[PDB]
Amino acid sequence: GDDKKELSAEKEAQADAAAEIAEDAAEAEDAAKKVELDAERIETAEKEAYVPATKVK
Amino acid sequence: MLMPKEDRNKIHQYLFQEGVVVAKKDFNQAKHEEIDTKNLYVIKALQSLTSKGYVKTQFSWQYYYYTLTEEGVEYLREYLNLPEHIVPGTYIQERN
Amino acid sequence: ALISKKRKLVADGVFYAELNEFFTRELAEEGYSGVEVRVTPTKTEVIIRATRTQDVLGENGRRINELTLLVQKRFKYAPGTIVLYAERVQDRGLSAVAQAESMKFKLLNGLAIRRAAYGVVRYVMESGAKGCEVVVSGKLRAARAKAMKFADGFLIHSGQPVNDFIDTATRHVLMRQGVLGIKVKIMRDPAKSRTGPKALPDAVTIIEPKEEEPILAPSVKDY
Amino acid sequence: QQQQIIKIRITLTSTKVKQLENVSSNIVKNAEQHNLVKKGPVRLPTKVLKISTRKTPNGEGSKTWETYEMRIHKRYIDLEAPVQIVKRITQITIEPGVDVEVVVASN
Amino acid sequence: GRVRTKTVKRASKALIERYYPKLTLDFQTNKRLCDEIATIQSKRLRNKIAGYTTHLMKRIQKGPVRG
RNA sequence: ACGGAAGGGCACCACCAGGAGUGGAGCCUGCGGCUUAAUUUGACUCAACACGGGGAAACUCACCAGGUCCAGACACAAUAAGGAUUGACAGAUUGAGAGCUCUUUCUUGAUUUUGUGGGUGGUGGUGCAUGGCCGUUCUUAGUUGGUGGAGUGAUUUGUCUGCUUAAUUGCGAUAACGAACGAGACCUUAACCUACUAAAUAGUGGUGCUAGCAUUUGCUGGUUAUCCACUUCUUAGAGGGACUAUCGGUUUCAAGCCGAUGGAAGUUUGAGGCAAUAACAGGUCUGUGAUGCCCUUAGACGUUCUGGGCCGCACGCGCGCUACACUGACGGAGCCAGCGAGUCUAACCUUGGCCGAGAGGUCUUGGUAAUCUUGUGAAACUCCGUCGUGCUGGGGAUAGAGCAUUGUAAUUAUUGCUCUUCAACGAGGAAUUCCUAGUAAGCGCAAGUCAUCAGCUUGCGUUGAUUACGUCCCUGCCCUUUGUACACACC
Fold this sequence. Notes:
This is part of a larger assembly, with chains A (57 residues), B (96 residues), C (223 residues), D (107 residues) and E (67 residues). Chain A is mostly helical and 57 residues long. Chain A has 2 helices and no strands.
């Protein structure tokens, strides 16, 4: 920034401050899916999901 | 990375269950606390998960803190093939 | 366990260090302003001084759950041994850290350097602070780096009152051109004080006596 | 009906002397408030954990050293008492920063 | 060097100016007086003030002083 | 802002008056130079050179000779379920029990491969792009604003000739008056407390219990609780205490300064911590997952593994260590500190008992600690001898041989031990550093570093002088006056 425009800065800055306070005032009072994971793997822990038979000589 | 799909499943499942992972910045660590894999497998699989916008990664003090994201709940839902409204630490505990 | 008390106390300090670091990283855009840890029976309690507890909660307590789980698994805690509480901080405009974060996100949202610092000092002063200052050191659009002081009101710089009153914070904001540092100073009103000395060692108030109506010949009174 | 004397020692240990003397003096006072037998707050020679360091991140400059310190104050109070009142006194009077340790013991 | 600071001599000034119907050429009672009249955050400061207002008290007893 | 212009001050990083030295010697150690496959590098007046906590066997590590690995997220595309891709026994090969590579041919299943974009790591570059941090100016005393006076104004007075302080510290003069940052206050530590609160994790007195010598009562110990009592010593909480007090010299009888007395203490009580505004292209991208830009990214400047090197030696320079002896070496013997620190998912501090000349081994033990190591029985030092001024028995370099300890590893010899070898140095040129009281210097610890290694440093206590209490001559820096064509400010 430069000094030739100084006032302007302050003003907007000051305005900003005010704005903040309004926000600070706004906030001063302003205005399921169960199943789980281990229990879902344990709820689906019923079999019919594997296959193995080998060993030859 | 290049890892058998079993360890990848250990990872993705575990993350899906906890929603939160941690891992120290030290590869060559043989085995990770809890998860049944190489530490590096976890760190890198996680890096993959985040760099496609499914999880979030943080550091500080030589430790990786991994958060799971909602889109990541979609993709991990697909990858674990479980039905919609499935799991994750998104149920307010017992009563605590 | 079974440690020596020296090593335990130092360890506790380090625990706080890693804690504050981690939260400061994780709770940036949520007005995190500091933590405190309390060793109780049953649990260990971690309190989060923020300005946006509505987010630190998250979707009906999802994110605070995440943070608790994080700290837990990392520091090796057994589920329930640790409990976290999101808590609003009173007067954001008297915490250094909160302001450093403020202007950091001002400049990160691309606001005028002068207007940012001046707006910050303005808000800090309007929150009834004794004095305030914002140093800005780095490079802005130029190439040869510079620095800027923006201070309003009263501050002291020497002695123990430093510890008692003024608040320092350094914050490294990094942008497309390089980085720049925010040094914030907040001198809180010694008057209000609450706990600790309510005035500068400098201070010496003289109590104003009374105009007497003397003279008058003796006499006595009976009861 | 519980209640029976067990020779107790409590150690308070902290760095914040204000809260420490706070909870210590409050403990002895609020204890003897109902006529126990005690040996009241015993002060162990305060500990100075020093650290000596070059202030510089690099090597340059006149060799300026700096000395940080953390101060450990440790107290202990001896109380002869039953079961309930101890559990009550360790449940409450809790202070963040002040570390309490409740031993029974006699050997 | 024992050149008393500005705040000291200023305070002493005010005090002699508004409590001459008290005090003396005795440090102890001036110190104690100071404690009963002036809110001072320091013992050391208060003793400096009291000692200087004491010396001034002695040197007013044999003539005037500026201020 | 600056002067190679004038007048003032301040200061042991300045003299004076002295002390202990360094500078000469041997070694220790950093820097240069040279040497080198490499001998990684930042830093070069105060403010570089026992500095990067920089005491490198691996590691560290950045260098050199060599060997693996991808930990190249992600997108599109290409390959391809007839197999995209992974691994490997022995052999050949390699320093290597690396399936690195090849011989041969089992395997594995879509996790990879190739290619593009896009990423990432990097002790690679840029401290002349930055943050932060630090050092310097500075052992400094400077900065500002309200009402008022002067000037159209930028601005000036306040903020000053003198005096006085360590101090823009005050007094005083006075168009200025009354303030605020900084100094001071404050904080921390060493000093005082037969005053308060106390304590088998501190200690005292008495009593039990018991040994020795006297014996007449006594003198000198033992007994982690045999009881009772206490708080002088020890410990740390709240207080008190000094405010240069009282008197008196001296000066504008102002600030103050000097001297006596008292006092735990009267040099800011001694020593520190903090410490405004402003500047430097001071140092740090070799602390950071602080960072812009550039460079590198698979025959890697990523990373890891083996070996070497930062220690290399005609020589120049800086910090040091040990000495030239008789206020001494040796050997007996006397024997006294304070700051510390110590083992959980581990082997740290270690008494004690044996074994050995020693170093050390071994068998147990206390201690997460005011409780055990430990009274840290440290060293100068004190005492009685031996030597007798002779490169001597001062001095311990260089070196051969043997034993141990740390460690996966000790050769270029980590350290420790024992025997022998017995250098230079006979007080040190020109020059030059530090210092004013429990300070100098002499003396040893503890801590950092640390598996092992202090000739280093940070602190600590032990013994304890001489000479000032001044000045502006050398130097360094502040301050006014003055000049200026500088203001990116004499680079």
